Amino acid sequence: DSLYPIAVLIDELRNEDVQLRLNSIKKLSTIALALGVERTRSELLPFLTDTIYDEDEVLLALAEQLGTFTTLVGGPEYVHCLLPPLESLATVEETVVRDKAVESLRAISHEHSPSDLEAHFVPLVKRLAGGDWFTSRTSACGLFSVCYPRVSSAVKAELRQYFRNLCSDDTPMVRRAAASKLGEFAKVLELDNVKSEIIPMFSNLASDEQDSVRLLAVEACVNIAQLLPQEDLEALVMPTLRQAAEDKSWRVRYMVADKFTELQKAVGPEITKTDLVPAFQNLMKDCEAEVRAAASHKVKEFCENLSADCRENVIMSQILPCIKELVSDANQHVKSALASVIMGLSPILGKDNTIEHLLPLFLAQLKDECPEVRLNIISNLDCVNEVIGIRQLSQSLLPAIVELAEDAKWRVRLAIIEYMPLLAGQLGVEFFDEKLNSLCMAWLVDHVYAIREAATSNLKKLVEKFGKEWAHATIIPKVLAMSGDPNYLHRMTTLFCINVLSEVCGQDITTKHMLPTVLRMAGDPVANVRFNVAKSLQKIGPILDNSTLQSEVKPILEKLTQDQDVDVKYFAQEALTVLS
Amino acid sequence: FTKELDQWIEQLNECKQLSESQVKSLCEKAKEILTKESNVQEVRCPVTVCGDVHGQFHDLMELFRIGGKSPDTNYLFMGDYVNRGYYSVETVTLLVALKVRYRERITILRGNHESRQITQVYGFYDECLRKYGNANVWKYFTDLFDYLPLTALVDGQIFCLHGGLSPSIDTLDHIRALDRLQEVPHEGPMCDLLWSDPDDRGGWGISPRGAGYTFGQDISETFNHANGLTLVSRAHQLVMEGYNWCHDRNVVTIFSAPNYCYRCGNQAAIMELDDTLKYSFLQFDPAPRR
Amino acid sequence: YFQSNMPILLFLIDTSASMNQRSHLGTTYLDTAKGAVETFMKLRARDPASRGDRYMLVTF
Ligand SMILES: [Mn+2]
Ligand SMILES: [Mn+2]
């Protein structure tokens, strides 16, 4: 007989095409539903466990399937029958299959009830941690956090003992997995038990021979510090952080640096003032560029979170000279990392401190060769603007940013455009016309379309600020000149400018100055300009006076809706509907 | 039908793929649109010429930010939209959607990677499997790749193309006479148009690749003179500066994939041709990825 | 004393204008000759002894 689903119809699908095997595994629910649940537990699952396959994708799909097999196996009561096949998957050489198997195991952990967790899952964890192969030992690390909260105290002490043994194992990757899972595992433990069991082994992990285990130890250091009471961190976490920050390997010091802000938040401000600021100092003054860049991006977050009473003293006494040396760093990545956060110190330091100390540092970074530095500096100009006002901005930073309106990289010019409304809103018509109006016009003819779009959108805000008479005197003539340009990009740019300008220029200006220019472009040879004319007439329809619609706009749209280009037809007829 | 296409384009601009049925209907429409196109498509003068994209979707978004949005900017893509990139599916789907929506504003040519073998080997097939679970989307796109025109002809002067020239092809009438509805062969006139490269040599040569030829300046000079061309626009080769003039301005290579395999660190350029065939190359750097 | 382990491969490529004749391949005789030298070195490179081969070029 060849109709038993269990052996037959499955082991015949071992063909060369892997996708058929994944399809069989993907539809393993249907075969299981066909079988009786008792028959499934008796025959299907032992077949899966005993047999061993050698294709990573099928194994991954099989592990993913077993996480949702609780309904098709007999409910949560019999869910322990899923433990052998996933155990077999947890011992494979491939790491991804192991992680998926551990995920499925901890997903079916919830299905078990406390008694079944103690009866079946905890022996499984013991077997995995006690296995001959290290792969099972690393697999056992991720299983502790889900079995721990819902077991008896003796079993919890046992779990602590096996995690401690696993951490202190001679095998490196087992220690790596244990250190990685230490943060999650220590989350649920009792605090006194954390101090007694986790902390000594954590300190042992930080002092290990290998460097990857130390890196993962410092990773877990943040969570471990966060868990503990503040009265205990001087003797428990802080010596470990001191050890780690001075480690020979730059990877450990780096990942200390990225985690520094969370350490600051966890341990409380007085401990940071006393002990963290030399660690931050020699992280910024460190030899390696990676750790210097990692520390630089944390300067703003670190300084903002200190106690205000002793904050500025810390900043100028310890942080600021290190910043001064980082601004002239040889590596451009360090300078870029510093640039993205340096303006955040302006409200913290105050106005006079910013002018005397921070402003030369901004100016030095605004003239850097590296584009990333220049881009990161400008993006946070609103902060320094609000701090020092605009008189100091015009005195110090305005000539530097005007030089950056012609930058080689267009994202710098985009930042400058994005920061023009602020300046406009804080400066008069006369000064803006003297200095910056030509800059606003220079961008409309830029090569990059994003620059032209940003400048067009910026014109709307500029007209909103300085009124429409200023627009008629300074904005409109230079926009209309672009309509006669031989490049169709510039004609389309005027159509976009008219799109954003009709809204703010009012009925009269739109009717008599902008509309006749829009209508004469219907005879353009480029179809793109023609259907953008149709789009513009659709868009400036509401803000035109209603008298010139049927007389002037409608004949042009009627001429366009019979045009030869299909896109011109479509946009002309869409405009015709919208005009109603 | 057009509203749904616009919705797909808006969705695809955010790097969210379409469903299998959507891809099937899109490729049906694209097949019925690409049947009518000649092997040598005729493109009007105001157009932006782009080289390989190779599935770098965010670099394609940077390209659109540089040159402009379709349909406002006419675009000519010279093949190689898939492989060597993480978002080949989204890239090719967006380009096909733009072709279906804006027929006269988009020209998509066939690259050498628009073939069943190259897609199977170099990750478009794998990407399709990962993002859909079955090869049906890959089937639809590879069947659609057979429909792509081999070359374009801007203004009758500039001969856009992916690979290069062939010893067996002397005229554009030969290219117009080819049957492009087939998998790209390993040898023959159609292979060279997608696989050949220029070289600083004399005459023809064996390509370092397994296909195509490598041709010197005299070849492109004779081709341009015999066919009344002023320029052979091109793709298919990494350019560190994004574009490079070759053969005394007879050939120009354009590469529109900055940081090509996410490791080459190259620039990317696009040739913007205005109404009067006045060109300008817009070099651009890879986009900032989150 | 004498290095016979570094063979000299002198190629005397005919560069007379008669080598501009076109084969049925669409390439000239000179293109065929250059391809022949390239193919020769590709075939030679399969031999591990090919290292140290001196390649020389003389023309007409
Ligand atoms: Mn190519
Ligand atoms: Mn390519």
UniProtKB/Swiss-Prot annotation, chain A:
Changing P172L: In HJS2; reduces PPP2CA binding; reduces PPP2R5A binding; reduces PPP2R5C binding; does not affect PPP2R5D binding; reduces PPP2R2A binding; reduces PPP2R2B binding; does not affect PPP2R3A binding; decreases phosphatase activity of PPP2CA. SUPFAM superfamilies: ARM repeat (SSF48371). Residues 40-314 are annotated as: Polyoma small and medium T antigens Binding. It is found in: Cytoplasm; Nucleus; Chromosome; Chromosome, Centromere. One of its GO terms (biological process) is regulation of meiotic cell cycle process involved in oocyte maturation. One of its GO terms (cellular component) is nucleus. It comes from the Eukaryota. Its main location: cytoplasm. Changing M173V: In HJS2; likely pathogenic. Coiled coil: none annotated. The modification N6-acetyllysine is found at K273. HEAT repeats lie at residues 1-39, 40-77, 78-116, 117-154, 155-193, 194-232, 233-271, 272-314, 315-353, 354-392, 393-431, 432-470, 471-509, 510-548, 549-580. Residues 78-232 are annotated as: SV40 small T antigen binding. Residues 393-580 are annotated as: PP2A subunit C binding. Keywords: Acetylation, Cell membrane, Cell projection, Centromere, Chromosome, Chromosome partition, Cytoplasm, Disease variant, Host-virus interaction, Intellectual disability, Membrane, Nucleus, Repeat. GO terms for molecular function: protein antigen binding; protein heterodimerization activity; protein phosphatase regulator activity; protein serine/threonine phosphatase activity. PROSITE patterns: HEAT_REPEAT. Changing M173T: In HJS2; likely pathogenic; disrupts interaction with PPP2R5D and impairs interaction with PPP2CA. It holds the Pfam family PPP2R1A-like_HEAT. The PR65 subunit of protein phosphatase 2A serves as a scaffolding molecule to coordinate the assembly of the catalytic subunit and a variable regulatory B subunit. Upon interaction with GNA12 promotes dephosphorylation of microtubule associated protein TAU/MAPT. Required for proper chromosome segregation and for centromeric localization of SGO1 in mitosis. Together with RACK1 adapter, mediates dephosphorylation of AKT1 at 'Ser-473', preventing AKT1 activation and AKT-mTOR signaling pathway. Dephosphorylation of AKT1 is essential for regulatory T-cells (Treg) homeostasis and stability. It comes from Homo sapiens (Human).
Swiss-Prot record, chain B:
It is an enzyme of class 3 (hydrolase). Its EC number is 3.1.3.16. SMART domains: PP2Ac. Coiled coil: none annotated. The active site is at H113. Mn(2+) 2 binds at D80, N112, H162, H236. Changing Y260C: In HJS3; severe decrease in phosphatase activity in an in vitro assay; strong decrease in C-terminal methylation; decreased interaction with PP2A subunit A PPP2R1A/PPP2R1B; loss of interaction with PP2A subunit B components PPP2R2A, PPP2R5A, PPP2R5B, PPP2R5E, PPP2R3A and STRN3; decreased interaction with PP2A subunit B components PPP2R5C and PPP2R5D. Belongs to the PPP phosphatase family. PP-1 subfamily. This is Serine/threonine-protein phosphatase 2A catalytic subunit alpha isoform.
From Swiss-Prot, chain C:
Widely expressed. Expressed in heart, brain, placenta, lung, liver, skeletal muscle, kidney and pancreas. Induction: Frequently down-regulated in nonsmall cell lung carcinomas and prostate cancers. Down-regulation in prostate cancer is due to CpG hypermethylation of its promoter. However, some involvement in cancer is unclear. It is found in: Nucleus; Chromosome. It comes from the Eukaryota. Belongs to the Integrator subunit 6 family. Component of the Integrator complex, composed of core subunits INTS1, INTS2, INTS3, INTS4, INTS5, INTS6, INTS7, INTS8, INTS9/RC74, INTS10, INTS11/CPSF3L, INTS12, INTS13, INTS14 and INTS15. The core complex associates with protein phosphatase 2A subunits PPP2CA and PPP2R1A, to form the Integrator-PP2A (INTAC) complex. Component of the integrator complex, a multiprotein complex that terminates RNA polymerase II (Pol II) transcription in the promoter-proximal region of genes. This is Integrator complex subunit 6. The gene is INTS6. The chain holds residues 1 to 55 of 887 of the full protein.
